[PDB]
Amino acid sequence: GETTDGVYRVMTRRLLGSTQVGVGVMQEGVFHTMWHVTKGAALRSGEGRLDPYWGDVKQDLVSYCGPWKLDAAWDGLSEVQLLAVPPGERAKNIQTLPGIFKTKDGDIGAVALDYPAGTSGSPILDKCGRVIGLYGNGVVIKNGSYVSAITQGKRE
């Protein structure tokens, strides 16, 4: 299948037409998405098969063909870009200064951008183009608007 670095849509035909369930990153031969997109299922790339390798329902992360490779972190200061890939719509950068999820276990970057559920797995970037985490696991606030965690994995 296609192994070129970049961002990819995650599609299914198990519903009406071809439905975009999410997004992911291909880097160093490994496909990175959120767990709730695939539920740990195998993926097709044309005629190639992608088999799950690592995943964790609590982090809501999964990798295919190898271990999680993305280890860049939000610096806690600078603005970031969501490389949103919405269903039926072209890849679009959205620049934002992340807010903060304060948890008993520490602080996490968060982006206040509302996109459709099928946008889950779209990467968040820094100034140098490196992926600092993925969009699509967050909360709905007093208003009714969505805030996503900047969800990042560990590189072993």
């Binding site: 609590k58 959205i94 934002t96 968060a110 696991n137």
Partner: protein, 39 residues
Amino acid sequence: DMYIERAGDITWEKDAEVTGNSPRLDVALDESGDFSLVE
């Protein structure tokens, strides 16, 4: 049975649409990986 299609390069795009705010939220993460608002 899920499949992938390439959607773009991963590049920072100088002068892209700047938007969204920066809220500080108290949250809890349960064992199912669901975030909730503590209050």
